[PDB]
C-alpha cells in the first residue's frame, strides 16, 4: 500500500523525507507557505550582477557524515570550499575562529603553540571567559558580538552556543573541523529542486498548512515551528531574527565572504559578500548584505532559537502536547526548537524516513519524534 | 616489436616515461643510483614519530593540467591540501603571499580592497617603465617597506646575491593580492597523496615489463645493449663534468624532534637576513588528516652547491648558461639517447610539469617508432 503523505515545508527536512518515501512508492504532497522552495537554504542569482545570493544568510555545507556527503553529491556538484572568516575590531583585521595568528597578532607576540597556552593560562583567571581567556581578549571578540547577537548581557549564563566554534593553538583558520566541506556549484535551490524531482512528489507553494487537512492523509511530517502548530497556546518560543540590508558594489567590497564586526558600537553584526562563495565564477558587480540581529516578533522570520531557561520550560509544554498526537511527526530546527546545520538536518531526515518505512513493514506505530528532544 | 629500454633514474621522469612504454610492450629497465625510488620526491616515515617526511624538501602537488591530475589520481588517493605559508619578521607573524591581511597588519589599517590598491600604488614607483631586476620589480609594485621586510633578506639568503643582481622574473610570479585569499598557489588542482609520493611512484612503476635496480650507477658501456636510453641524471655529470660543474644552490635540512606542535603550520618563512635559515618546516602539517604527537621539524639553509652536495636550484645566469651551451653542443652529437628532467636539462620543474613532459617524451618516442624516424636528444627547448 502506498500511503498518502503530507509534508509541511520544502527545505531540507521536507525535501529529503519526501524523496525517500516517494522512492518507495508513497504519494507525497509537499507544501510551503513561501513563494519558492528550499527553506532558509534557498539561494538565487541577483538579476543586475548575476551573483548567486544566499538569501537567508551565508550557507556553507560541512559534515563528518560520509553518507550525507555522498547523498548530496548525487544531487549537485560539490565545489571545494573553505570558510575563512575575518573580523574587524579595534582598528585591526583578524582571522577567526580564534587561532594562533589571532593571539599573536592581538598581543603583538611571536608565540609558538605551547608558548601561547602558557600566555593564555596567565591572562585568564561571562564567567567561562575571564578564567580561560582573559580580560583583554574577552572584551575584544566576544562581549560586543554576543550582546549584538543574542541581545542580553554577557552577564547571563554562557557555557553553550559559542562552542560551535573551535579555539586553536595552531594556524588553522578553517571555521569548521569537519572532514567534508563544499559549496554546490549551481546552488542549494537546484540541489533541492533535484531532490524534489520525482514523479510521486507534488509541490505547492504559497500554501499555508491548515489543521483541517490532517484527516486526508495517512501521515503528516511537519517542519514548521512547534509552537505555531499549537496556536501558540502557551506562549511564543524565543527566537532571534535577522534583517539584511542589501546593496550593490562595482568591485570587491571587502575581499572575503564574511567579515564580522565585534564592536557593539557598530550596528550590523557582519557583512557578507556573496560572490566570495562562488570563487569558480567571476563577477564585476558585487551583492552584499549588512546583517542586523533583533528579537523575533510575530511577523519576522525565526532564525536562532534562544533556549535559555524559560524557553526550555515553555518548550517542554509543547513537547508533552505533541507526545499525544497520532499521525504526525515533527522534524527540523523549527519543528524541534534546535539549531541544526544542513548536514545534521539531512541526516535526521533520512533516518526519519527510514523509521517510517520500517514502521509500515513491521506494522508498528510511527513515533512523533525520531530524535531526542526531552 | 618490443624495444630494449634503459631509463636512468627513478623519480617522476623515469617512472612516467617507463610506464608509458611498458604499456606498449617494451622491455623497460630502470636504474637508480640511490637505494630507493622517488628521486627528489621521495618521502618516508620517521622511526620514532611515524610522521611522513618529505626528505628532499616539502613537496606540494599543484596544476591546471587536468590530464596530469587524472593520471596521478590513478596512482594515489589525493587529499585536499591548501598551502598556507606564514612569515616571521620584525617581531610579528604574517600571512603570505602578500594579501589584504598582510597589508592591513603591516601598515596598521583596515583598508578595503580598493583602498589597498591605492595605498600600494602610492608606495610603488610607477616611474620604472620595465623592471629588470628583482629589486626594481619590488620597488615598482610593493614599495620599499614591504620589499625590505619580506623579500630582501629572504632573497639574499636563498640566492647568495643582492636583489639588484637577480632577475625580475623570480618575483613576477608573485603579484600582491588585494583580497584575503592566502592560498600560496593559484592553481585549480592542488593536494597531497595520502600514502605519499613514494607509494605513488611505486604504483607507477608496478607494471609487467619493468625491472628496477637500485644502488646502481649508470655506466657508459650500457648504451650498446639498448634500443634507447632515457637519462634524467645531471647533464654535466654524464659528460664527466669535463667543462666544469653547472651552478646550483644547495640546501641543508637540519632535523629535530619536538613533543607536540612546534610551530603550528607546515611552513614558516624567516624573512630577516639575520636569521640564518630561510625557513622551518613541520612535516606533519603536510598530513593534516593524520594525528601525531611527536613532530619532525627542519631548519633549511641555502648555500652554494659544492662538488658533493645535492643540487636543488639551478642558478641559470650568463656563465652557467655559457657552460650549459658547451654540454648542449655535444649532447646534440649523441645518437640513441634522450636527456630529460630537471637535472637532464638544467631547469627547475614542478611535479606536474615534469610528468607532462614525460608523457610527451614517451609519446614522441612511440610516434617515432611507427615512423622509423630518429628520436631527438631533447623533447623540449633548451637553447
Ligand atoms: C542565519 C543562518 C545561517 C545559516 C543557517 C541558519 C541560519 C539561521 N544554517 C542552518 C540551515 O539553514 C538549516 O539547517 C536548514 O534551513 C534546515 O532546513 P529545514 O528544512 O529543516 O527548515 P527550513 O527552515 O529551511 O524549512 C522550513 C520550511 O517550511 C516552511 N513552513 C514553515 N511553517 C509553515 C507552515 N505552517 N505552513 C506551510 N509551510 C511552512 C517554511 O516556509 C520553510 O520553507 C546553516 N547550516 C549549515 O550547515 N551551514 C551554514 O552556513 C548555515 N548558515
Ligand atoms: C627544494 C625543492 C622543493 C621542491 C621541488 C624541487 C626542489 C629542489 N619540486 C620539484 C620536483 O622535485 C621535481 O619536479 C622532480 O623531483 C623531478 O623529478 P625527475 O625524476 O625529473 O628528477 P629527480 O631529480 O627527482 O630524479 C632523478 C633521479 O636520477 C638518479 N640519478 C642521477 N644520476 C644518476 C646516475 N648517473 N645513475 C643512476 N641514477 C642517477 C637520482 O638518484 C634521482 O633519483 C617541487 N615540485 C612541485 O611540483 N611541488 C613542490 O612543492 C616541489 N618542491
Ligand atoms: O564573531 C563572533 C562570532 C560568533 N560569536 C558567538 O558565537 C556564535 C557563532 O555562531 P554561528 O557563526 O554558527 O552563527 P550563524 O548561524 O549565524 O553562522 C552561520 O553562517 C556562517 C557563515 O560564515 C557559517 O556558515 C556558520 O556555520 C553558520 O551557522 C554566535 O552566535 C555568537 O554567540 C561571537 O561572539 N563573535
Ligand atoms: O618570504 C619570501 C618568499 C619568497 N621570496 C622570494 O620569492 C622567490 C620565490 O619563492 P617561492 O618559495 O615562492 O617559490 P619556489 O621557491 O618553489 O620557486 C624566492 O626565491 C625569494 O627570492 C621572498 O623573498 N620572501
Curated annotation (Swiss-Prot), chain B:
EC number of this enzyme: 5.4.99.9
Free-text disruption phenotype from the record: Abolishes lipopolysaccharide (LPS) biosynthesis.
Alphabetical keyword list: FAD, Flavoprotein, Isomerase, Lipopolysaccharide biosynthesis, Signal
Reaction(s) the record says it catalyses: UDP-alpha-D-galactose = UDP-alpha-D-galactofuranose
Pathway(s) where this gene product acts: Bacterial outer membrane biogenesis; LPS O-antigen biosynthesis
Entry keyword Signal: yes
GO cellular component, one term: cytosol
Signal peptide: 1-22
Comment on bound cofactor: Binds 1 FAD per subunit.
Binding site for UDP-alpha-D-galactose: 83, 150, 155, 159, 184, 269, 279, 313, 348
GO biological process, one term: O antigen biosynthetic process
GO molecular function: flavin adenine dinucleotide binding; UDP-galactopyranose mutase activity
Amino acids binding FAD: 13, 32-33, 40, 59-60, 218, 342, 349-354
Record-linked Pfam families: GLF, NAD_binding_8
Cofactor(s) the protein needs: FAD
Membership in a protein family: Belongs to the UDP-galactopyranose/dTDP-fucopyranose mutase family.
Purpose: Involved in the biosynthesis of the galactose-containing O-side-chain polysaccharide backbone structure of D-galactan I which is a key component of lipopolysaccharide (LPS). Catalyzes the interconversion through a 2-keto intermediate of uridine diphosphogalactopyranose (UDP-GalP) into uridine diphosphogalactofuranose (UDP-GalF) which is the biosynthetic precursor of galactofuranosyl residues.
Record text on subunit structure and interactions: Homodimer.
Record's protein name: UDP-galactopyranose mutase
High-level lineage: Bacteria, Pseudomonadati, Pseudomonadota, Gammaproteobacteria, Enterobacterales
